[PDB]
Point group: none
Chain length 135, copies 3
C-alpha cells in the first residue's frame, strides 16, 4: 500500500499557526510550490495466466466412506464461558461492566478450504479506542 | 490502495490559524502552487486469462458414502455463554452493563469451501470508538 | 481504492481560521493554485478471458449416498447464550443495560460453497461509535 497515515490532530502541507498573546508584525511571506505526484500502482501486463483444477476417477471400491480433496474442521474464536454462582449481588457501585464476549472491528478476508488466488489482497485498519471513561 | 488517512481534527493543504488574543498586522502573504496528481492505479493490460474446473467419473462402486471435492465443517466465532445463579441482584448502581455478545463492525469478504480468484480484494476500516462514557 | 479519508472536524483545501479576541489588520493575501487530478483507476484491456466449469459421468454404482462438488456445513457467529436464575432483581439503578446479542454494521460480501471470480471487490467502513453515554 502507499501513503497510509494516522495523524492525531493538525495535518497540513504548509501551516501557519499563531496561537496565544502573540504579536505578528509586518512581514513578507512568499511561497512558490511545485508538488506534482505520479502514481503507477497495482499495474499488471500479464499474457496467458491460467488457474486450473481437474479431478478424474477410475475403477475401484470407494463405497464405505470416501472423501476427495481436503476435509476441514477447525475451531476458531470458540469459547464456552460458564459462570456459576448463588447470591450474586451488585449494590451502590458506580461504573460496572460485565463483558462475557465483546468485539470491535473483525475482518476476515479469505477463510476457505481451497483457494487459488492471483493479484492483490489488502486489509487496513485505522482507529482510536476507549473502552471505559467514568471519572 | 493509496492515501488511506485518519486525521483527528484539522486536515488542509494550506492552513492559516490565528487563534487567541493575537495581533496580526500588516503583511504581504503570497502563494503560488502547482499540485497536480496523476493516478494510474489497479490497471491491467491482460491477454488470455483462464479460470477452469473439470471433474470426470470412471466406472466404480462409489455408493455407501462418497464426497468428491472438499468437505468443510469449521466452527468460527462459536460460543456457549452460560450464567447460572439463584438470587442475582442489582440495586442503586449507576452505570451498569451486562454484555454477553456485543459487536461492532464485521467484514467477511470471501468465506467459502473453494475460491478461484483473479484481481483485487480490499478491506478498509477507519474509526473512533468508545464503549462507555458515564462520568 | 484511493483517498479513503477519515477527518474528525475541519477538512479544507485552503483554510483561514481567525478565532478569539484576535485583531487581523490590513494584509495583501494572494493565492494562485493549479490542482488538477487525473484518474485512470480499475482500467482493463483484457482479451479472451474464460471462466469454465464441467462435470462428466460414466456408468457406476452411485445409489446409496454420493456428493459431487464441495460439501459445506460451517457454523459461523453461532451462539447459545443461556442465563438461569431464580429471584433476578433490578431496583433503584440508573443506567442499566442487559445486552445478550447486539451488533452494528455486518457486511458479508460473498459467502458461498464455490466461487470463480475475476475483477475487483472492495469493502470500506468509516465511523464514530459510542455504545453508552449516561453521565
Amino acid at each position: 500500500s502507499i501513503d497510509v497515515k494516522y495523524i492525531g490532530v493538525k495535518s497540513a502541507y504548509v501551516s501557519y499557526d499563531v496561537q496565544k498573546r502573540t504579536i505578528y508584525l509586518n512581514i513578507t511571506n512568499t511561497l512558490n510550490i511545485t508538488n506534482n505526484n505520479y502514481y503507477s500502482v497495482e499495474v499488471e501486463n500479464i499474457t496467458a495466466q491460467v488457474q486450473f483444477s481437474k479431478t478424474v476417477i477410475g475403477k475401484a471400491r470407494l463405497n464405505n466412506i470416501t472423501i476427495i480433496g481436503p476435509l476441514d474442521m477447525k475451531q476458531i474464536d470458540y469459547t464456552v464461558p460458564t459462570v456459576i454462582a448463588e447470591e450474586m449481588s451488585y449494590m451502590y457501585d458506580f461504573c460496572t461492566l460485565i463483558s462475557i464476549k465483546v468485539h470491535n472491528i473483525v475482518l476476515m478476508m479469505q477463510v476457505t478450504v481451497t483457494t487459488t488466488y492471483f493479484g492483490h489482497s489488502e486489509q487496513i485498519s485505522q482507529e482510536r479506542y476507549q473502552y471505559v471513561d467514568c471519572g
